[PDB]
Design a protein around this ligand. Structure first.
Ligand SMILES: [Zn+2]
Ligand SMILES: [Zn+2]
Ligand SMILES: [Zn+2]
Lengths: 168, 244, 33, 49, 89, 46, 115, 69, 101, 305, 42, 24, 44
């Protein structure tokens, strides 16, 4: 997660030859999906993206204390001006190419530097496994081959279907 | 497959197994999130392996995903494409969209997977180009027509649909009719495709295909369209920014 | 993998039981009971 | 496919159906038993009559 | 709490704070169990009536009409059935 | 309220006819719903 | 490996937060591309990972106390080390002469950690 | 903890550049972006590695169990 | 030899052999795209494309259909040969420019 | 199209060649092939790197596996042609030969320095061998290698890489086996500190632009890209080759109407940096060769039905 | 051909078609009658 | 209120590959 | 010299039934110390 309540679960460790790559010849460390934004309105992450890229370029720490900017002095303008002075696109977009096809993507894509936090934590699988002496039903476990339970919410589902053999 | 809480039967469906080298997690197509109410935020699922042919038959014919296109609550779609795939569709099916012979053929093959159970033919069929001269060009709408043409039954007339999408004509310019979705004899002749057409959306194209040609064809169209848009996105991608 | 105990439930041993966690218990020639 | 599930080999190698052996599948099951418990697609045991 | 600020140009620190209030503000099982436990064995019979498992007749029709909900979408979609007549046949 | 209903059943010398889904699950009987709502027989020649 | 944030609140310095790095500066792209990043799922670069990115560790401490049974200041039955009866010998791959494990040893389920 | 050997993205060796980078800021009194350039770090990939390194190891090293404090 | 590298997918190859699908192991876009580019220059080819079933199985599917002068297998061979020759042209050109530099 | 037509039109331009980096253009080649070379240079051109690390002792603050990892990232200045590949089906004894493997050792103990100038902060004068560098990897030749590598000892390409730090009483003791591998397998084998390309700039002006517009227009591109001509007073393009494609022009309303930004479209500007083992040109040659062998190896494989 | 199956667990399904959608009534907006789940319980 | 102060004297610190500061 | 005192740091060794304590301090808490031995790693 970034520092804006945009928490994500790692889906793939994507091979770098398969990632998109920038005009600058860089591959992203992390991808976050644009569809993760319009419902949450973490506009502060977009600001951090510009500011962080501009900071990495100019060798500059960027102050992001709340309420230092305002409507007559916006950060998108401020940091954008800084990117333009560095030689990158003022809106924080960058041209990229598909790792798979090799071709330039349809539009410039939004890229930058955002501080990320790794969140501390486990899966389980069972073939079969130890049962309890009295009921001969699967023991509770995980660390010993724990078996999930088909529950009554699952009973009701099986009736709603009537997979009677699955129930049996 | 099962994700808890299991509050209706579609949170426990039968899936066909596909073993994948090098994976450490279960991989699940997006079209199923609706049913399972799954978010991909580190949520877990259970996989149960029935152990005799009666249970096999039931999981493949009764509790299997494929039928369960419509919900029993109101009889409406629960499976469709989302996000990238909707954005991609608006772009691919735009009037401004043209493709050379090379590109057109490549989009087709990348999404058809003719080496499947959908040997509707054992040869891929293509349309003639829309523009013959000065240069051979196909439109995006032709990619759709070509897709349907390769996955619907050949001994059966092409679908006929008059529908609408979410985008008003005014957005395209004077005189546009792109809000009107027209399928004649299986060909997309007018309109873009939208959340209203291959989202989980009553009376759109995929629900229409579901009625006329059955759930197997509709499920196939849905997967095909998914690869098409995924590929189209890898080739032209995706949208951001402050400027917006 | 040894425990010696429980000989073997096959009258052409008795050859010599180790239990795997999966509860087959396995004797060397290769009965799993 | 929208009707499939991607199964990791770590599962594929530990989960067995009990398959009954017949004329129509003797080739397949021969290979599984040869492959053993640890090479997928293999087998972990045999039930006798 | 009328906020004239917008997420683009920020809210008065003031707007932000008020907007935290609004966000924090928002932050049936037993009923379902009882319905299902009583309705569990009520089903459609081969005579089209709706019966409980002990044979008790609950309704005379599946819906008074025997008619699947999941096969219903196009039954009164006549113009869609008239084009497409031949495929339906 | 298990013991109450049980007490009632005993004092009625009740027979559980085993027709409800609950009862059949208790005794391990195939459910009365569904693929179970009919019998299958084989047509044999000779 | 933590990094100082490039984008910082000035108070981050005032509370001495660099003494406890809490994250790292990633190159982040807001892109639909892999197809595996919908529903708030995210992608990490495989080479980035292989080069140390978010390369973290977990530590667990277990207490082995064989005075657990003995009834209070009792005679001692069990002493760390090896006896002179016959025992595996594969054991010495994990364990030093004292019956404690050599520091650094790789240890997977079932291995000795104590004798 | 200690300087990474290679830049995560470039592959470019960066581990020989930490001690000098500090000496540039300290002795030659340069700003960060000038010093990074002087060490040959051109791509922002690579500038990021040295610019934002935290030599946390120098803290770890103050706890040495093998000497009488 | 090595028989496990490329195989015919007989369920999408016609009787006359003017149309065929091949499955090649251990190859992605790199060779696939380059090979279809070359093949499509062959005037007897009516259709050609490649696809990658899944990023996790190292497999490459090539489809070739001809107008009937040569078989599909011929076009695959001319394409492969054409591709080899094309690399030679590049290697030689690069060499000369390095020398002349 | 035709291979001869390609030969006549293909062209190479070498802007700058150096022992570490190359900048050159491939002109009139298809993107599919430029991309191939690029992919191959990063991921399939073999290199030598440490693969197996054998610890005998490490009482430093840095954990074994982490230390092993960094040693694996150290680019060894070794010609990969001087080595054959390991067969990973043989037992460990048979696996590693004088044609297979290069052995590096590392052996440091840290002691306290008595002669430290009292009140010192510098660990060089406080401790002996506090800092361990890549240059401290000693090359131990095996068998025939005493001869073969006598003219080129094995040295890290970047000697001053910081590998570990120690305090009095701590020691590191390890041997490393270094073998052939490719980037696609693990990035430590990639022979580039990066190979990439860009398509060449094409800035074409859709009508003359002069006077105060010319000066304005000129400042939307880096210094030297846009020239103002004396006489016609109109702006023209000096060299697009210096342009960074910021699209800055397209922001200002007055110009967005009068400029299209494109590429000389195949025209690929390659930049290749070597990690230190081989020269750029060698790495690019090796890739153009690798592609050709793929095509050749395939042409000669029998197609099984 | 649109006739409902003999065998359908319409009872379970009706239960789910009332219980499941009612989870969308866990909260409320801002005659004067009893609403949502409380009412459904009454 | 005063705005957050603009940092004075910012120049290009990024160029397309193959060019540098004094090419501008 | 297998062990180390946790308080005074004196390096020292034990024997069969010996005083589990530092022979200098009398502190009864000892840290293990570790000896030339082969552990093998893959540099990945
Ligand atoms: Zn036996
Ligand atoms: Zn870098
Ligand atoms: Zn002591």
């Amino acid at each position: 997660s970034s520092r804006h309540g945009q928490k994500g679960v790692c889906s793939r460790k994507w091979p770098t030859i398969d990632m998109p790559f920038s005009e600058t010849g860089i591959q992203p460390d992390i991808i976050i999906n644009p569809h993760a934004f319009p419902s949450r309105m973490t506009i502060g992450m977009f600001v951090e993206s510009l500011a962080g890229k501009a900071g990495a370029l100019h060798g500059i720490a960027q102050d992001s204390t709340p309420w230092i900017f305002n409507e007559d002095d916006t950060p998108a303008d401020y940091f954008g001006e800084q990117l333009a002075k560095a030689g990158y696109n003022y809106h924080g977009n960058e041209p990229m190419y598909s790792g798979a096809t090799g071709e330039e993507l349809r539009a410039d894509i939004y890229v930058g530097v955002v501080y990320y936090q790794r969140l501390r934590h486990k899966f389980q699988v069972r073939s079969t496994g130890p049962v309890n002496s009295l009921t001969m039903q699967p023991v509770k476990g995980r660390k010993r081959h724990g078996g999930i339970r088909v529950g009554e919410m699952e009973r009701d589902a099986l009736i709603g279907h009537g997979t009677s053999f699955l129930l049996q | 497959m099962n994700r808890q809480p299991t509050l209706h039967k579609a949170s426990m469906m039968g899936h066909k197994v596909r073993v994948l080298p090098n994976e450490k997690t279960l991989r699940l197509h997006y079209a199923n999130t609706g049913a399972y109410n799954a978010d991909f935020d580190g949520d877990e699922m259970n996989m149960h392996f029935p152990q005799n042919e009666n249970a096999r038959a039931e999981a493949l014919n009764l509790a299997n995903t494929d039928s369960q296109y419509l919900t029993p609550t109101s009889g409406s779609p629960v499976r469709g494409l989302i996000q990238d795939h909707i954005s991609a569709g608006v772009w691919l099916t735009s009037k401004d969209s043209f493709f050379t012979r090379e590109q057109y053929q490549q989009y087709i093959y990348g999404c058809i997977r003719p080496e499947d159970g959908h040997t509707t033919r054992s040869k891929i069929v293509t349309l003639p180009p829309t523009i013959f001269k000065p240069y051979p060009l196909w439109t995006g709408k032709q990619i759709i027509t070509t897709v349907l043409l390769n996955v619907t039954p050949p001994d059966m007339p092409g679908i006929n649909l008059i529908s609408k999408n979410k985008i008003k004509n005014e957005y395209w310019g004077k005189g546009s009719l792109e809000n009107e979705v027209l399928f004649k004899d299986g060909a997309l002749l007018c309109g873009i495709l939208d959340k209203s057409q291959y989202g989980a959306s009553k009376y759109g194209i995929v629900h229409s295909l579901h009625e006329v040609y059955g759930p197997e064809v509709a499920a196939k169209v849905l997967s095909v369209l998914g690869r098409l848009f995924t590929n189209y996105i890898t080739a032209t991608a995706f949208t951001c920014g402050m400027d917006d | 993998t040894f425990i010696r105990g429980p000989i073997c439930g096959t009258d052409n041993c008795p050859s010599r039981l180790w239990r795997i966690i999966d509860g087959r218990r396995t004797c060397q020639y290769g009965h799993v009971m | 496919e929208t009707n499939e599930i991607g199964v990791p080999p770590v599962f594929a190698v530990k989960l067995t159906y009990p398959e009954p052996v017949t004329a129509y599948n003797i080739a397949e099951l021969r290979q599984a038993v040869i492959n053993g418990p640890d090479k997928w697609p293999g087998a972990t045991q045999i039930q006798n009559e | 709490g009328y906020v004239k600020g917008r997420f683009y140009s920020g809210i008065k620190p003031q707007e932000y704070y008020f907007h935290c209030m609004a966000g924090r503000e928002g932050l049936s099982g037993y009923l379902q169990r009882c319905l299902t436990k009583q309705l569990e064995g009520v089903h459609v019979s081969y005579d089209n009536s709706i019966r409980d498992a002990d044979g008790t007749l609950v309704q005379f029709m599946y819906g008074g009409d025997a008619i699947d909900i999941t096969k219903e979408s196009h039954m009164t979609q006549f113009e869609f059935c008239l084009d497409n007549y031949y495929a339906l046949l | 309220t298990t013991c109450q209903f049980l007490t009632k059943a005993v004092l009625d010398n009740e027979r559980e006819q085993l027709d409800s889904p609950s009862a059949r699950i208790v005794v391990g009987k195939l459910n009365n719903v569904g693929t179970g709502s009919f019998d299958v027989l084989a047509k044999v020649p000779n | 490996t933590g990094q100082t944030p490039i984008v910082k609140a000035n108070l981050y310095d005032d509370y001495g937060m660099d003494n406890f790095p809490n994250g790292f500066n990633a190159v982040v792209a807001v892109i639909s591309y892999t197809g595996y990043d919908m529903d708030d799922a995210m992608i990490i670069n495989k080479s980035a990972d292989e080069r140390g990115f978010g390369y973290g560790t977990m530590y667990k401490t277990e207490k082995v106390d064989l005075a657990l049974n003995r009834n209070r200041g009792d005679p001692i039955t069990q002493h760390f080390g090896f006896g002179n009866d016959e025992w595996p010998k594969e054991w010495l791959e994990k364990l030093d002469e004292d019956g404690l494990p050599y520091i650094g040893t790789y240890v997977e389920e079932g291995d000795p950690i104590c004798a | 903890m200690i300087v990474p050997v290679r830049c995560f993205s470039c592959g470019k060796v960066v581990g020989d550049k930490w001690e000098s980078y500090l000496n540039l800021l300290q002795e030659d009194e340069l700003d960060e972006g000038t010093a990074l350039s002087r060490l040959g770090l051109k791509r922002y990939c690579c500038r990021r590695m040295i610019l934002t390194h935290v030599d946390l190891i120098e803290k770890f090293l103050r706890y040495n169990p093998l000497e009488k404090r | 030899p090595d028989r496990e590298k490329i195989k015919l997918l007989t369920q999408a190859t016609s009787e006359d052999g003017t149309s065929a699908s091949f499955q090649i192991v251990e190859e992605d876009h790199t060779l696939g795209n380059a090979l279809r580019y070359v093949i499509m220059k062959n005037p007897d080819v009516e259709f050609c494309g490649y696809s990658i079933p899944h990023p996790s199985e190292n497999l490459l599917n090539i489809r070739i259909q001809t107008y009937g002068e040569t078989t599909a297998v011929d076009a695959l061979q001319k394409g492969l040969k054409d591709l080899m020759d094309l690399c030679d042209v590049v290697e030689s050109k690069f060499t000369e420019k390095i020398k002349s530099m | 199209w035709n291979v001869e037509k390609f030969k006549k039109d293909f062209e190479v331009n070498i802007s700058s060649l150096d022992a570490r980096e190359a900048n050159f253009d491939l002109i009139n080649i298809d993107t599919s092939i430029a991309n191939a070379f690029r992919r191959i240079m990063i991921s399939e051109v073999p290199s030598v790197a440490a693969e197996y690390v054998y610890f005998f002792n490490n009482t430093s603050v840095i954990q074994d596996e982490v230390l092993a990892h960094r040693i694996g990232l150290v680019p060894l200045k070794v010609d990969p042609d001087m080595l054959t590949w390991v067969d990973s089906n043989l037992p460990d004894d048979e696996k590693f030969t004088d044609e297979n493997t290069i052995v590096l050792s590392l052996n440091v103990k840290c002691t306290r320095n008595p002669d430290a100038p009292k009140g010192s902060t510098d660990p060089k004068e406080l401790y002996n061998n506090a800092h361990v560098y890549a240059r401290d990897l000693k090359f131990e030749p095996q068998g025939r290698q005493s001869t073969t590598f006598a003219d080129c000892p094995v040295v890290p390409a970047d000697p001053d890489i910081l590998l570990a730090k120690l305090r009095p009483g701590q020691e590191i003791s390890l041997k490393a086996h270094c073998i052939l591998g490719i980037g696609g397998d693990h990035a430590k084998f990639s022979p580039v500190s990066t190979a990439s390309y860009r398509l060449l700039p094409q800035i074409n002006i859709l009508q003359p632009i002069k006077g105060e517009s010319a000066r304005r227009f000129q400042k939307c591109f880096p210094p030297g890209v846009i020239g103002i001509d004396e006489g016609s007073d109109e702006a023209y393009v000096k060299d697009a080759r210096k342009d960074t494609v910021s699209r800055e022009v397209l922001r200002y309303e007055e110009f967005a109407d009068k400029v299209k930004l494109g590429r000389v479209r195949n025209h690929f500007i390659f930049n290749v940096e070597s990690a230190g083992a081989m020269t750029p040109e060698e790495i690019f040659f090796k890739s153009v060769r690798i592609l050709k062998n793929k095509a050749e190896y395939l042409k000669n494989c029998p197609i099984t039905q | 051909r649109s006739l409902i199956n003999p065998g359908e667990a319409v009872g379970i399904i009706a239960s789910q078609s009332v219980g499941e959608p009612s989870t969308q009534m866990t909260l409320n907006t801002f005659a004067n009658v009893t609403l949502g789940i409380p009412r459904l319980r009454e | 209120r005063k705005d957050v102060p603009k940092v004075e004297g910012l120049k290009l610190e990024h160029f397309a590959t193959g060019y540098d500061a004094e090419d501008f | 010299l297998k062990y180390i005192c946790a308080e005074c740091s004196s390096k020292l060794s034990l024997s069969r039934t010996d005083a589990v304590r530092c022979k200098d301090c009398g502190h009864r808490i000892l840290l293990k110390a570790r000896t030339k031995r082969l552990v093998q790693f893959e540099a990945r």
